[PDB]
Nucleic acid binder design. Structure first.
Ligand SMILES: [Zn+2]
Length: 263
DNA sequence: GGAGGCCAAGATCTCAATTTCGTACAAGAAATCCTTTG
């Protein structure tokens, strides 16, 4: 019940409620999310994947493998009878407001074209490419707690095991279909608050000074310029407060810079 | 007739550019020095 996949299912993937059929009583944990059957009420959906493996998917997890062409359009014309699947979308993200239980889908223009009219009635979709997810997140007033999926991808198991509720703008957890180990959440953690304050205070600096700051910090985070050189560049360009507002972590620096150069 | 395998197709996009070690030293003894000188 109170797990990350359940919220995204209720808010976003409940649109294909008609297109699964009834569950089946199961006696083994859902291989996709991995949690225990005790929170499935003893029911589950059996399935066999493209690799011929018997896998049990619970109610909110099985929705990532449902074929609903009459709702989700056709994903590949070579196979008309299998429409877009939530677990197979690559480049498509979403933002799910758990407390409101609503969802907004960030799909590129191609996917939006492939989606039928009936899809938009249940889920509001805004055309945005993979790089434009950050633009929507920055510009639009997010409502927390929320689940921000960045790349539905094709590795549905890793996607569901990477879902994490973003309790506030200080730490928005991106779910990019890559298994969110404790080693790599720095690459999937976005601090919209720090990026927002840095963007607010960057207005005081020239465009040339901006380019200089971004390039210097990027090179430093990639160890392509010595720290003394970067310090000289910051001091000569009066970029000290900007560095003071940057995280010490170089990967977070790169992430927030990537966000900055998108907005 | 079902059940393995081989292939094609699926959304657009991520940023960064590198150049050559260290310089000069030398103690009290069996030794062979020796063999003297002759
Ligand atoms: Zn599950």
């Amino acid at each position: 019940m109170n797990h990350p996949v359940e919220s995204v299912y209720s808010a976003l993937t409940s649109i294909l409620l008609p297109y699964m059929g009834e569950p089946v009583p199961v006696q083994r944990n859902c291989s996709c999310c991995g949690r225990a059957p005790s929170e499935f009420d003893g029911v589950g959906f059996e399935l066999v994947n493209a690799y011929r493996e018997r896998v049990v998917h619970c109610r909110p997890c099985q929705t990532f493998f449902v074929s609903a062409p009459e709702l989700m359009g056709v994903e590949n014309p070579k196979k008309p009878t299998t429409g877009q699947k939530f677990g197979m979308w690559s480049g498509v993200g979403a933002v799910i407001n758990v407390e409101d239980n609503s969802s907004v889908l960030l799909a590129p223009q191609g996917v939006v074209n492939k989606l039928p009219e009936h899809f938009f009635d249940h889920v509001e979709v805004i055309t945005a490419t993979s790089g434009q997810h950050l633009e929507y997140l920055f510009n639009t007033e997010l409502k927390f707690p929320l689940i921000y999926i960045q790349n539905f991808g094709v590795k549905t198991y890793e996607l569901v095991r990477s879902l994490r509720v973003s309790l506030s703008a200080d730490a928005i957890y991106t779910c990019a279909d890559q298994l969110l180990t404790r080693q790599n959440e720095v690459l999937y953690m976005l601090d919209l608050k720090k990026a927002k304050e840095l963007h607010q205070e960057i207005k005081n600096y020239s465009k040339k000074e901006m380019d200089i700051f971004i390039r210097t910090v990027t090179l430093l985070a990639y160890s392509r310029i010595t720290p003394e050189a970067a310090s000289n560049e910051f001091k000569k360009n009066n970029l000290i407060p900007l560095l003071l507002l940057l995280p010490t972590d170089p990967h977070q620096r790169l992430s927030i810079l990537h966000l900055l150069k998108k907005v």
